[PDB]
């Protein structure tokens, strides 16, 4: 059964609630983004209205074969009416197509559901600036002060500089980047741009990327692995055994691998600066873990909430343990006392 924090009171709506069967009272199912923990349950046999972004609806139709008549894509930054209720979709700064949803309830209550997001000051100048928000359904993934990480721009600077140096020293080095979901495309696109290469990948991953409205994409990606010196592999293959095996398949074209695993946070964040990150090495294989996050750090999350000043916060992540819930509630109260709302 569907948990309360996936239900929008005073509507017939749910958010990211496709794994519970037919939800009683639900007239419209919203999907914030195409990540499996959130779409779990959708397929060609789904026959209720799904509301989402254009990019998300391309993925639903092409990857999961949801029939077109049930996909309701909405433009961003535009007031729309769904089953009698005004809604707006806003960019979540998460993966491609990911949205936050503003609901304007018939009784005057305003609710923001962030989906998954990486808070940014640029959100302080969207349509959120224009009215009060009463209830916030918040992505609390990294809601603890230990979770610090660098800007996405610092991380990509590190990656491009690392790759360009390695391949200029050894033109027979191959670069490999791990992936298992959409998101974090900048990692492999920025490294291929500095090297003058396309990114090579499986037909299944190429298909996924072609749903994303990324500009000039036919110019940056390919299924012809032989023509590319940046390859994408599944995340599970980014280890010494998997990479040794891949290097064998390349037929003596290459004699070294430099590989990147874009994780979110790891405890090497609490001690070490990005500039100071070093790889794990075995023979002619090196593996870099880089802290490229598509979720808010603690400080970014606190700044957003202290700006928005909601009356009530409902966490949507880390809600399964009493210790996690009590921790999060204590920071919410600190934030409110410090800012004065
Ligand atoms: Ni996500």
Curated annotation (Swiss-Prot):
It is found in: Nucleus. Changing residue 295 to A: Impaired nuclear focus formation, reduced interaction with PIAS and increased sensitivity to cisplatin. Expressed in brain, heart, kidney, liver, pancreas, placenta and skeletal muscle. Induction: During mitosis. The mRNA encoding this protein contains an internal ribosome entry site (IRES) in its 5'-UTR. This 5'-UTR generally suppresses translation while specifically promoting expression during mitosis, when cap-dependent translation may be impaired. It comes from the Eukaryota. May be required for DNA interstrand cross-link repair. Also required for checkpoint mediated cell cycle arrest in early prophase in response to mitotic spindle poisons. Possesses beta-lactamase activity, catalyzing the hydrolysis of penicillin G and nitrocefin. Exhibits no activity towards other beta-lactam antibiotic classes including cephalosporins (cefotaxime) and carbapenems (imipenem). Belongs to the DNA repair metallo-beta-lactamase (DRMBL) family. Binds constitutively to TP53BP1. Binds CDC27, which is itself a component of the anaphase promoting complex (APC). Binds PIAS1. This is DNA cross-link repair 1A protein. The lineage of its organism: Eukaryota, Metazoa, Chordata, Craniata, Vertebrata. The chain holds residues 700 to 1040 of 1040 of the full protein.
């Amino acid at each position: 059964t569907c948990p309360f924090y996936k239900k929008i009171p005073g509507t017939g709506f749910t958010v990211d609630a496709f794994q519970y069967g037919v939800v009683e009272g639900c007239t419209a199912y919203f999907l914030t983004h195409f990540h499996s923990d959130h779409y779990a349950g959708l397929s060609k046999h789904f026959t209720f209205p799904v509301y989402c972004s254009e990019i998300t609806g391309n993925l639903l139709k092409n990857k999961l074969h949801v029939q077109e008549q049930y996909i309701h894509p909405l433009p961003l930054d535009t007031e729309c009416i769904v089953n009698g209720v005004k809604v707006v979709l806003l960019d979540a700064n998460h993966c491609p197509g990911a949205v936050m949803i503003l609901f304007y309830l018939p009784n005057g209550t305003v609710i923001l559901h962030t989906g998954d997001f990486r808070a940014d000051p640029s959100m302080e100048r969207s349509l959120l600036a224009d009215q009060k928000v009463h209830m916030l359904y918040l992505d609390t993934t990294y809601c603890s002060p230990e979770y610090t990480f660098p800007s996405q721009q610092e991380v990509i600077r590190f990656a491009i500089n690392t790759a360009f140096e390695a391949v200029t020293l050894n033109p027979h080095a191959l670069v490999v980047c791990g992936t298992y979901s959409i998101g974090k495309e900048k990692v492999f696109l920025a490294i291929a741009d500095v090297l003058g290469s396309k990114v090579g990948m499986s037909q299944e991953k190429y298909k996924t990327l072609q749903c994303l409205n990324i500009p000039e994409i036919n110019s940056l990606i390919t299924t012809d692995m032989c023509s590319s010196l940046v390859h994408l592999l599944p995340m599970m293959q980014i280890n010494f055994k998997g990479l040794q095996s891949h290097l064998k398949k390349c037929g003596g074209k290459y004699n070294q691998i430099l590989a990147f695993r874009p994780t979110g946070w790891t405890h090497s964040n609490k001690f070490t600066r990005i500039a100071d990150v070093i790889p794990q090495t075995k023979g002619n294989i090196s593996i870099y873990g880089i802290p490229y996050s598509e979720h808010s750090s603690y400080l970014e999350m606190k700044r957003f909430v202290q700006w928005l000043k909601p009356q009530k916060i409902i966490p949507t992540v880390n809600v399964g343990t009493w210790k996690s819930r009590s921790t999060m509630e204590k920071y919410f109260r600190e934030w409110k006392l410090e800012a004065g709302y």
